[PDB]
Design an enzyme around this catalytic site. Structure first.
Site, PDB file in Angstrom:
ATOM      1  N   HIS A  62       0.957  -0.927   0.094  1.00 15.48           N
ATOM      2  CA  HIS A  62       0.230   0.552   0.430  1.00 15.48           C
ATOM      3  C   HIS A  62       1.135   1.272  -0.253  1.00 15.48           C
ATOM      4  O   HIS A  62       0.164   2.784  -0.608  1.00 15.48           O
ATOM      5  CB  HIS A  62      -1.427   0.399   1.207  1.00 15.48           C
ATOM      6  CG  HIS A  62      -1.806  -2.130   1.213  1.00 15.48           C
ATOM      7  ND1 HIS A  62      -1.962  -2.112   2.365  1.00 15.48           N
ATOM      8  CD2 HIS A  62      -2.852  -1.950   0.398  1.00 15.48           C
ATOM      9  CE1 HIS A  62      -2.673  -3.807   1.517  1.00 15.48           C
ATOM     10  NE2 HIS A  62      -2.959  -2.983   0.393  1.00 15.48           N
ATOM     11  N   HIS A  92       4.970   6.540   7.305  1.00 21.48           N
ATOM     12  CA  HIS A  92       4.435   6.096   5.942  1.00 21.48           C
ATOM     13  C   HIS A  92       4.246   7.518   5.398  1.00 21.48           C
ATOM     14  O   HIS A  92       4.441   8.681   6.135  1.00 21.48           O
ATOM     15  CB  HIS A  92       3.825   5.261   5.927  1.00 21.48           C
ATOM     16  CG  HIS A  92       2.584   5.259   6.623  1.00 21.48           C
ATOM     17  ND1 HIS A  92       2.228   5.113   7.535  1.00 21.48           N
ATOM     18  CD2 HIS A  92       1.356   6.025   6.026  1.00 21.48           C
ATOM     19  CE1 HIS A  92       1.096   5.743   8.104  1.00 21.48           C
ATOM     20  NE2 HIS A  92       0.776   5.792   7.213  1.00 21.48           N
ATOM     21  N   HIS A  94       1.845   9.043   2.358  1.00 18.01           N
ATOM     22  CA  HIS A  94       1.143   8.988   0.667  1.00 18.01           C
ATOM     23  C   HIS A  94       0.921  10.033  -0.058  1.00 18.01           C
ATOM     24  O   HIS A  94       1.109  11.364   0.540  1.00 18.01           O
ATOM     25  CB  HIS A  94      -0.999   9.270   1.393  1.00 18.01           C
ATOM     26  CG  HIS A  94      -0.531   7.909   2.564  1.00 18.01           C
ATOM     27  ND1 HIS A  94      -1.610   6.847   2.314  1.00 18.01           N
ATOM     28  CD2 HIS A  94      -1.311   8.282   4.198  1.00 18.01           C
ATOM     29  CE1 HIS A  94      -1.810   6.263   3.714  1.00 18.01           C
ATOM     30  NE2 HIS A  94      -1.253   7.893   4.790  1.00 18.01           N
ATOM     31  N   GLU A 104      -3.831  13.334   1.959  1.00 16.52           N
ATOM     32  CA  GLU A 104      -5.364  12.372   2.940  1.00 16.52           C
ATOM     33  C   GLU A 104      -6.201  13.818   3.720  1.00 16.52           C
ATOM     34  O   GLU A 104      -6.891  14.088   2.938  1.00 16.52           O
ATOM     35  CB  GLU A 104      -4.352  11.481   3.645  1.00 16.52           C
ATOM     36  CG  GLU A 104      -4.149  10.538   2.792  1.00 16.52           C
ATOM     37  CD  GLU A 104      -4.640   8.923   3.548  1.00 16.52           C
ATOM     38  OE1 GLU A 104      -3.771   9.084   4.890  1.00 16.52           O
ATOM     39  OE2 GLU A 104      -4.526   8.576   2.775  1.00 16.52           O
ATOM     40  N   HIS A 117       3.130  10.257   8.019  1.00 14.04           N
ATOM     41  CA  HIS A 117       2.286   9.617   9.120  1.00 14.04           C
ATOM     42  C   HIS A 117       3.080   9.437  10.049  1.00 14.04           C
ATOM     43  O   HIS A 117       3.508   8.177   9.350  1.00 14.04           O
ATOM     44  CB  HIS A 117       1.165   8.685   8.293  1.00 14.04           C
ATOM     45  CG  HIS A 117       0.146   9.375   7.863  1.00 14.04           C
ATOM     46  ND1 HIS A 117      -0.991   8.434   7.668  1.00 14.04           N
ATOM     47  CD2 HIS A 117      -0.301  10.782   8.436  1.00 14.04           C
ATOM     48  CE1 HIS A 117      -1.904   9.778   6.951  1.00 14.04           C
ATOM     49  NE2 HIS A 117      -1.014  10.585   7.233  1.00 14.04           N
ATOM     50  N   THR A 196      -6.577   6.228   8.182  1.00 19.00           N
ATOM     51  CA  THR A 196      -6.796   5.623   7.156  1.00 19.00           C
ATOM     52  C   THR A 196      -6.939   4.401   5.938  1.00 19.00           C
ATOM     53  O   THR A 196      -7.112   4.911   4.890  1.00 19.00           O
ATOM     54  CB  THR A 196      -6.202   6.864   6.336  1.00 19.00           C
ATOM     55  OG1 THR A 196      -4.881   6.706   6.089  1.00 19.00           O
ATOM     56  CG2 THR A 196      -6.597   8.327   7.265  1.00 19.00           C
ATOM     57  N   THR A 197      -6.853   3.790   6.476  1.00 20.64           N
ATOM     58  CA  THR A 197      -6.834   2.401   5.699  1.00 20.64           C
ATOM     59  C   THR A 197      -7.533   1.412   6.568  1.00 20.64           C
ATOM     60  O   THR A 197      -7.300   1.450   8.050  1.00 20.64           O
ATOM     61  CB  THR A 197      -5.282   2.452   5.220  1.00 20.64           C
ATOM     62  OG1 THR A 197      -4.005   1.473   6.245  1.00 20.64           O
ATOM     63  CG2 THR A 197      -4.062   2.957   4.402  1.00 20.64           C
TER      64      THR A 197
HETATM   65  N1  LIG Z   1      -2.269   6.157   7.504  1.00 22.26           N
HETATM   66  S1  LIG Z   1      -2.505   6.208   8.891  1.00 22.26           S
HETATM   67  O1  LIG Z   1      -3.910   6.173   9.698  1.00 22.26           O
HETATM   68  O2  LIG Z   1      -1.678   6.724   9.752  1.00 22.26           O
HETATM   69  C1  LIG Z   1      -2.278   4.091   9.669  1.00 22.26           C
HETATM   70  C2  LIG Z   1      -1.208   3.637  10.744  1.00 22.26           C
HETATM   71  C3  LIG Z   1      -0.826   2.593  11.152  1.00 22.26           C
HETATM   72  C4  LIG Z   1      -2.217   1.966  11.207  1.00 22.26           C
HETATM   73  C5  LIG Z   1      -0.862   0.296  11.242  1.00 22.26           C
HETATM   74  C6  LIG Z   1      -2.400  -0.755  10.541  1.00 22.26           C
HETATM   75  C7  LIG Z   1      -2.905  -0.446   9.840  1.00 22.26           C
HETATM   76  C8  LIG Z   1      -3.891   1.180   9.674  1.00 22.26           C
HETATM   77  C9  LIG Z   1      -3.058   1.618   9.622  1.00 22.26           C
HETATM   78  C10 LIG Z   1      -3.466   2.876   9.151  1.00 22.26           C
HETATM   79 ZN   LIG Z   2      -1.320   6.937   6.889  1.00 23.43          ZN
END
Ligand SMILES: NS(=O)(=O)c1ccc2ccccc2c1
Ligand SMILES: [Zn+2]
Ligand code: NA
Length: 257
Positions: A62, A92, A94, A104, A117, A196-197
């Site tokens: 992703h 990470h 986006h 996002e 993030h 957000t995933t």
């Molecule tokens: N994109 S996000 O909201 O920062 C985020 C951060 C940690 C995650 C860990 C596992 C699944 C989804 C995650 C999403």
């Molecule tokens: Zn994120």
């Protein structure tokens, strides 16, 4: 037929597997700068990343995650709107297919080229997996990226990406200092939201910095050469891995400034 970012598996489909996608505190959101409330009670954000221990970088299909050792209080976030201490686990990004999209969160409907993030979990829950089951389990520090001057502290990440081109690849990534990804100002907006995933859990205190960082066109172009597919499968460029803004549902966004 797993979730991802297309016509048939992208954000508008996620609710079928994860019905919290239509929940009351989903992220991201558009930040209406004029309606965000200045809260004089909010404290400076404390970002204490000196002792961070970057371990590894992973292409998870992703995005890519830069992972940290979170088995001791090292890199921690606190203050701001937070009670207690949140440990950095990973960061990470986006990003978009074009510079005009990729973030996002949006700011008065403005989309940035990308969004970083930095993910932290509340140490009162003992680890990440327990923390995501709590409404105050995570604190995610979001930082916008715009294209302009290069970010020198990003280049180590960009240069390792060819080694993790495809999903499931990892590479050693020690001694990466995330302080090099931070803008000058720690002024922020904050609101309660979600991952957000998938699984879209409603466990996040979002802290979104006002000031973006600049990255070069060449740096973001390298993000865009990553792949969502695995090795030996047809190439699917890893672009537009962002969820659009979700309904605010009368949450207040609070400004530190
Ligand atoms: N994109 S996000 O909201 O920062 C985020 C951060 C940690 C995650 C860990 C596992 C699944 C989804 C995650 C999403
Ligand atoms: Zn994120
Ligand atoms: Na350029």
């Amino acid at each position: 037929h797993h979730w991802g970012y297309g016509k048939h598996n992208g954000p508008e489909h996620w609710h079928k597997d994860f019905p919290i996608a239509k929940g009351e505190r989903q992220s991201p959101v558009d930040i209406d700068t004029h309606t965000a409330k200045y809260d004089p009670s909010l404290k400076p954000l404390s970002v204490s990343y000196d002792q961070a221990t970057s371990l590894r970088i992973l292409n998870n299909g992703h995005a890519f995650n830069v992972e940290f050792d979170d088995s001791q209080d090292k890199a921690v976030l606190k203050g701001g709107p937070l009670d207690g201490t949140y440990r950095l686990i990973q960061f990470h990004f986006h990003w978009g297919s074009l510079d005009g999209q990729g973030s996002e969160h949006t700011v008065d409907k403005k989309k940035y080229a990308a969004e970083l993030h930095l993910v932290h979990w509340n140490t009162k829950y003992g680890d990440f997996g327990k923390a995501v089951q709590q409404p105050d389990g995570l604190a995610v520090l979001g930082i916008f990226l715009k294209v302009g001057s290069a970010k020198p502290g990003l280049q180590k990440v960009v240069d390792v990406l060819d080694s993790i081109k495809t999903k499931g690849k990892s590479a050693d990534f020690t001694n990466f200092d995330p302080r090099g990804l931070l803008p000058e100002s720690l002024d922020y907006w904050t609101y309660p939201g979600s991952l957000t995933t998938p699984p879209l859990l409603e466990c996040v205190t979002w802290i979104v910095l006002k000031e973006p960082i600049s990255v070069s066109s060449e740096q973001v172009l390298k993000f865009r050469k990553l792949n969502f597919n695995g090795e030996g499968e047809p190439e699917e460029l890893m672009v537009d891995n962002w969820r659009p803004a979700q309904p605010l549902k009368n949450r207040q966004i609070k400004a530190s400034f």
